[PDB]
């Protein structure tokens, strides 16, 4: 799904996706009837005339390579996995945009009596990126209440973006998504309307155009075969059950307040493999990293 959910391309340079112009090329040579200028070949003038936004450009800016996801190393903070959009306007207006991921696979922490599999963190980052690829990112002011900061003396409430709640998985998302919707916002209706509009645009205009290559047409066909309600219901609680991976579940986006982490170094011919942690999550032999003394403690 990540590999087929290309951001929606823009139409031709004049707007629209329906059909390009026509070019008459290759007039036949004259004969006894002569004037075979009209007996020639017909060509779609702009072929694949749609303009894509998911592309990386070479240093010389004369070559382009399609790209939906690029995974980088961490930014300033060594242990902080992040997902960033390419265009902010296109991540919220339904166009969709490519995502860049900051992921650190060499460190992990221990919760209770098990270690956190980095596969689940990468999966969470990919699920979050699926929002940007579909252009259904909510506004930054759609925070829902997450925790009453009882440690404080003034009544203040921590807030959490709805994407974090939806993709983090656990009991917190199931206390918000209820059988009737106690919490509702115009974001869901607007996103559904935009998604349906783009699906209709594809089905009526792109699907049927004979001057667009299958590389974009077929990928857009599979992109819209998934209902928008499926992406909202896609959380870590599904992959944790489908992978048998144990992870923190309650207030998992605020664990910095609860306990202080202690990170472990993971090398990856030995400590982690295609089958996951060697000798299981619980019994894998790991060594505490030397960066535990470099943690910044700002209370």
């Amino acid at each position: 799904l990540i590999s087929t959910a290309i951001p929606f391309p823009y139409g031709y340079i004049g707007g629209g996706y329906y059909a390009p112009n026509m070019i008459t090329f290759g007039s036949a040579p004259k004969s006894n009837k002569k004037l075979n200028s009209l007996i020639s070949s017909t060509i779609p003038f702009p072929y694949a005339g749609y303009r894509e936004t998911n592309y990386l450009s070479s240093e010389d800016n004369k070559s382009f390579y399609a790209s939906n996801i690029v995974i980088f190393g961490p930014g300033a903070n060594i242990v902080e996995n992040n997902t960033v959009f390419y265009k902010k306007e296109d991540a919220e207006n339904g166009m969709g945009t490519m995502t860049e991921i900051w992921f650190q696979p060499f460190l992990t922490y221990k919760y209770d009596e098990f270690y956190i599999d980095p596969a689940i963190e990468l999966i969470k980052c990919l699920i979050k990126s699926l929002y940007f690829l579909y252009g259904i990112k909510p506004s930054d002011d759609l925070v829902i209440p997450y925790r009453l900061r009882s440690e404080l003396e003034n009544i203040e409430y921590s807030q959490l973006n709805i994407v974090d709640l939806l993709v983090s998985g656990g009991i917190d998302p199931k206390f918000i998504n209820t059988d009737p919707y106690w919490f509702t916002d115009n974001y869901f209706s607007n996103a559904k309307k935009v998604f349906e509009d783009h699906r209709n645009i594809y089905e009526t205009q792109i699907e049927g155009n004979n001057a667009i290559g299958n590389d974009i047409k077929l990928r857009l066909k599979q992109k819209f075969r998934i209902n928008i309600n499926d992406i909202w219901e896609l959380n870590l609680n599904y992959f944790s059950k489908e992978f048998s991976i144990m992870m923190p579940d309650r207030f998992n986006n605020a664990l910095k307040h609860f306990y202080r982490k202690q990170y472990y170094k993971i090398d990856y011919p030995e400590n982690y493999s295609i089958n996951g942690f060697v000798n299981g999550q619980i019994n894998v032999q790991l060594s505490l990293s030397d960066r535990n003394q470099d943690i910044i403690n700002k209370p």
Binding site: A19, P20, N21, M22, S37, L38, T42, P44, N209
Partner: protein, 374 residues
């Protein structure tokens, strides 16, 4: 004044109507000293918007519904890009100016009372286009009639087609399904499949092109029992006999090019065609269930020398075959009849025990290990 009866009528005046004051909208070309100039255009979604001129009795919806029922469905026909092109060769040591305008099909809905039309609403459908040329010298004055048109005129077909708006051969086939290829080149009556008409002037050339910028094609289905011979069911049996894979889409282009002689003007008519597949169900010498599938094909071209009008009624709904006579009968495996297989070539003697299958006539698939009479 008309000789019809009191009531409402839908009338088609044909193709080749050019609107007033709309001659040099698209522009023109200048050629000189034997140079050949080719103009072309494509009718997609903006030069294909019809023009409605309604009356209180005949609103826009009333006009759109009635003409599309009797004549070509222009709503579904203008969605497919269609190209056209003209070519003119300038004479030796002379200059030629040639400009292109749009041609239209003119439909009307009229009301007749006491042999006199007392009301008329007019719809214009952009059909193909037209090219007008002249040989001029620098400084020469040309009559304004060449440049300007002060009234709508017909140039290709003078016609008036009206319809009142009413408010045993021995077939030695064994029993089983058959898919008969009845032939290619079927067109609907009343010019419902006309791509359009082009008037090529003397010494010029014209061409109508299906550029296939869109895959969309419209097959036709006429069944006698939708319970058994559904559209999907008929399509599956078409993929079984002749292995037809693409039904609603196509990717094959077709051009129709006509070079008019140097003496007389010619007009050319391009139609969309169909191939007729008959899915029958033979039982004891008589057909008990028949379905007809018209698969879109690669068009038909009619060339006619350009010619008082006569009010003629429209022919009944039906098809006319313009292609050659064809009859290819291919039997197909009747579904809902399980196929058993023997996974070994029969060498010289084999026995097959029928499994349980509890009547239900079935098929055994097999092959032999050596050619011979068994």
């Amino acid at each position: 004044t008309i000789d019809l009866a009191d009531g409402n009528y839908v009338v088609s005046r044909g193709d080749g109507w050019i609107l007033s004051r709309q001659n040099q909208i698209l522009g023109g070309s200048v050629i000189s000293n034997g140079s050949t100039g080719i103009v072309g255009d494509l009718r997609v979604n903006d030069n294909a918007i019809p023009y409605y001129y309604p009356t209180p009795s005949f609103n826009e919806e009333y006009i759109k519904n009635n003409i599309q029922t009797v004549f070509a469905n222009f709503t579904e026909a203008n969605q497919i890009p269609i190209g056209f092109e003209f070519s003119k060769t300038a004479p030796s040591n002379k200059n030629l100016y040639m400009y292109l305008q749009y041609t239209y099909i003119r439909y009307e809905i009229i009301k007749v009372l006491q042999h006199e039309i007392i009301e008329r609403a007019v719809l214009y459908v952009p059909s193909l286009g037209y090219v007008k040329s002249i040989e001029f010298n620098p400084g020469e004055k040309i009559n304004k009639d060449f440049y300007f048109l002060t009234n709508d005129k017909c140039i290709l077909n003078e016609q008036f087609l009206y319809k009142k708006i009413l408010e045993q051969r021995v077939l030695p086939y064994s029993n089983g399904l058959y898919v008969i290829n009845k032939g290619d080149g079927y067109i609907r009556t009343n010019d419902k499949d006309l791509i359009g008409t082009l008037l090529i002037e003397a010494g010029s050339s014209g061409s109508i092109i299906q550029p296939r910028l869109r895959n969309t094609t419209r097959p036709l289905f006429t069944t006698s029992n939708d319970a058994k011979f559904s559209q999907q069911y008929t399509e599956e049996r078409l993929k079984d006999a002749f292995n037809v894979q693409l039904f609603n889409t196509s990717t094959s282009l077709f051009k129709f090019v006509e070079e008019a002689p140097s003496n007389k003007n010619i007009c050319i008519k391009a139609y969309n065609t169909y191939e007729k597949y008959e899915l029958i169900d033979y039982q004891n010498g008589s057909i008990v269930n028949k379905a007809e599938y018209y698969l879109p094909s690669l068009g038909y071209c009619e060339v006619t020398n350009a010619p008082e009008v006569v009010k003629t009624q429209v022919a009944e709904d039906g098809f006319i075959q313009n292609g050659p006579e064809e009859e290819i009968v291919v039997g197909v495996i009747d579904p809902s009849e399980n196929i058993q297989e023997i996974n070994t070539a029969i060498s010289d003697n084999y026995t097959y025990n029928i499994p349980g299958v509890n009547n239900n006539p079935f098929y055994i698939l097999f092959t032999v290990n050596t050619t011979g009479i068994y």
